[PDB]
Design a protein around this ligand. Sequence first.
Ligand SMILES: [Ca+2]
Lengths: 92, 477, 9
Amino acid sequence: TATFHRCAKDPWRLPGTYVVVLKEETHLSQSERTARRLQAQAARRGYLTKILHVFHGLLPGFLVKMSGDLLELALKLPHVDYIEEDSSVFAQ
Amino acid sequence: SIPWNLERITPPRYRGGSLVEVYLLDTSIQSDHREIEGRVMVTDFENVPEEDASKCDSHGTHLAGVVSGRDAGVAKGASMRSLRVLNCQGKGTVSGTLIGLEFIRKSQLVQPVGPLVVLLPLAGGYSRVLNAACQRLARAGVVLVTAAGNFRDDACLYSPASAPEVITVGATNAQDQPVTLGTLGTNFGRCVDLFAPGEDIIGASSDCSTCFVSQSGTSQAAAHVAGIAAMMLSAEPELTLAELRQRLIHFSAKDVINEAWFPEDQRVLTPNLVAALPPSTHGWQLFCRTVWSAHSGPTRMATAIARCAPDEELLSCSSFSRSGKRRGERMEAQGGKLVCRAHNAFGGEGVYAIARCCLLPQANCSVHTAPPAGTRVHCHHVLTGCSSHWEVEDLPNQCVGHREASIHASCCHAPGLECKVKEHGIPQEQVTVACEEGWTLTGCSALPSHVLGAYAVDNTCVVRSRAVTAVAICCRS
Amino acid sequence: XAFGXFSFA
Ligand SMILES: [Ca+2]
């Protein structure tokens, strides 16, 4: 039931970095585990990943640098609510 | 000598922010500028993308000065903290902005202070995650003020502008008109909460420690509101976000924007309010606001929902479609709280549900419904609102509907509350009826020849048609 | 402006 989203304004997209948002009650220990599980499943497929940040305090989840090839895999991880591709913001 | 903008936000009768802290998410800032030195703490939090020094801290310094600058600021006292989420070219990321928002919440948990106002002078396209983080940060009790965006476009298409539970600010110029500059200019539409001065706004320049520059933008506009909010929270620290939003609206200049500048369909959706500081004149008052839903879309069973904040009561509910292809609206309960729901007709492009949400403590409000009979129902308590829906394809504390329609009355137990009903009819594109000065419009509906819809605009009830009669319900202590 | 930055570009 987990879904993917990326910016409709195409120039503002930033592929290769993704925000993985986990379900609301997920605990920090679980977020960390889910990121490692991801890196491991990716490595078995020959893909490098980098976990840039683990989110807690507002949303649980993590920020990851990886090929988009891995999105089908990531959406199937336990606890995942949705995944959003990073994108640009600009001073107004 | 007073800058046009600081005069504009000054109310017609008048006489800060130090208990309050304002966070700024922006470029780096020149913290030693004499406008702001000693008032701003640079956190040295930084999360910015790589490029692809005077100029680097230009944007941020100006806004820090607008908020708190000693000569040209709105909230001349206030304490500030800055996070760097925009690079030297003024570019950031959604991920970086989240990390910043997250940093603010963590700081707060570790060393709690008073009320927080967060200025987000930045925009990207619609972001599910960014809107969510903002919402969550708002529910934790933090006030967020953001720029509508500078694209002369519907602000709902951008984040954080579109983010639920946030004060979103568009920009007006010295003539109180929406800023438009070629293909760029203020955003507009229903996600904009209000406008504020945002053209030719003088403030601190990072060129030199005592220099000044005029800059323009919805960031500048939002900065005025953060300042106004810092002052409002200093005087009344216990304000909830909803109470604060109702105050910004109530104390705004009304019907001062010429709505011709905006696209035809966005005029009705766009609030005609220019922010201002509260007067010296202020005892309890009835505050209400008009809340437009997202458009329902064209599905045959489509519904649009307009909701109030948790601490507000829905006192009335109307709807509008541009075509007039409409099955009306109803007030229905949901998580023990009433919402405004509107129904699309078969073949309609969609409809808006339009709530009237009010701050009314001690209210016990309920709904009284009657099925098709004309159709009538009363509070057997004061009537604050009539709604009506039908299931067919075509056609004294009392509501009256069409003989084929269901009719719904919003009835409240509110002692100390007086209401009256004012009617007006004519032969007609628009009919109009206003509450008397000092009264608050609680409900607006059309007497049942083919109506497009009805909506409250401030304390004026507007009925739109293709012998039509506008009906306003007005209350006060 | 690209995109709406620094005073309407
Ligand atoms: Ca909003």
